[PDB]
Amino acid sequence: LDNGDLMIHLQAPDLGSLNSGSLVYFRKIPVGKVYDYAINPNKQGVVIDVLIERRFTDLVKKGSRFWNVSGVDANVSISGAKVKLESLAALVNGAIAFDSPEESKPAEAEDTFGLYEDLAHSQRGVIIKLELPSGAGLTADSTPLMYQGLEVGQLTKLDLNPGGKVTGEMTVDPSVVTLLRENTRIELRNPKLSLSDANLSALLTGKTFELVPGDGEPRKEFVVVPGEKALLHEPDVLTLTLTAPESYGIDAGQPLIL
């Protein structure tokens, strides 16, 4: 109708449950709808053309982030599972929602955006590259980064580069960016069982990264060492070598006592 509405494009790996007429939300308020959808000339991607009303043209910014809320999903959580249903229109047909940053220039003239598959995936953060030893108990979008007992990061990407090199990418919230400096150790904590203080939640979570802040020039890449090598890789540590004619029943976990 050319009523001053704003037409924008979203690039997605697939269309998903979104169809023509599915709504677009800001603070769960309908401010637009999907005008059309098509496939790119390259067969990999789908371009969804959406339209935002004239009143809400200034809502869309350059830094605005879009995610898809479609269908109904039930998640079972440890030590208590909660399933909540809020939108029935998104259950029946699907919808798109977007978040607008406070300080950004407005977007116009068919500006392209990336359609994230979930709000957690569309959460803002900083990418950190991790050189993991192995991915035996690491799950993408499920392993957190606990600092002082609170989750401040999330391992989102996990890959196996050739040569058997397990690598990963983790999104960290902006609050702990200043804590990522030189000689900062990001190690993995195995789930241990304590008879005096049993932690069923910690047992069920499994592998969990731990952040040990340091000082120096900020860095975006880290090498993850296990808890066995956590003491060895400390910034200050006295490393010693001792030779013997026999092992004397001493393994690689025995503690030195003074």
Q: Which of residues 213-232 bind a copy of itself (CB under 8 A)?
A: 213
Q: Which one of residues 1, 2, 4, 192 is an interface residue with a copy of itself (CB under 8 A)?
A: 192
Tokens read off for 108: 């116009």
What is the spatial distance between Cα 51 and Cα 57, in angstroms, rounded to a whole number? Answer: 9
CB of 36 to a copy of itself, least distance (A): 11
Binding mask 27-46 for a copy of itself (x = CB under 8 A): xxx-------x-x---x-xx
Of the candidates 8, 5, 100, 98, the one whose C-alpha atom is nearest the C-alpha of residue 54 is: 5
- By CB under 8 A, the count of residues binding a copy of itself is 73
User: Rounded to 5 degrees, what angle do the CA atoms 150, 132, 191 make?
Assistant: 45
- Concatenate the DSSP letters of all residues of 16-42 into one string: TT--TT-EEESSS-EEEEEEEEEE-SS
Phi-psi region of 151 (alpha: psi -120 to 50; beta: other; left: phi over 0): beta
Interacting positions 46-75 with a copy of itself (CB under 8 A): 46, 59, 70-75
Q: Is 174 in the site for a copy of itself (CB under 8 A)?
A: no
- Concatenate the DSSP letters of all residues of 136-204 into one string: SS--TTTEEEEETTEEEEEEEEEEEETTTEEEEEEEE-GGGSTT--TT-EEEEE-----SSS--HHHHH
Q: Is 105 in the site for a copy of itself (CB under 8 A)?
A: no
CB of 16 to a copy of itself, least distance (A): 6
Interacting positions 112-151 with a copy of itself (CB under 8 A): 134-138, 142, 146-150
Q: Is 198 in the site for a copy of itself (CB under 8 A)?
A: yes
CB of 91 to a copy of itself, least distance (A): 8
Q: Which residue bears the tokens 């220039």?
A: 105
If the CB atoms of residues 71 and 114 are measured against a copy of itself, the closer one turns out to be 71
Q: What is the DSSP letter of 113?
A: E
Q: Which one of residues 1, 54, 105, 195 is an interface residue with a copy of itself (CB under 8 A)?
A: 195
Q: Which one of residues 3, 103, 109, 196 is an interface residue with a copy of itself (CB under 8 A)?
A: 196
Q: Which one of residues 62, 77, 127, 215 is an interface residue with a copy of itself (CB under 8 A)?
A: 77
What is the spatial distance between Cα 191 and Cα 207, in angstroms, rounded to a whole number? Answer: 6
Contact 101, 61 (CB under 8 A): yes
Q: Is 16 in the site for a copy of itself (CB under 8 A)?
A: yes
Which one of 7-15, 104-112, 214-222, 238-246 is the stretch in contact with a copy of itself (CB under 8 A)?
A: 7-15
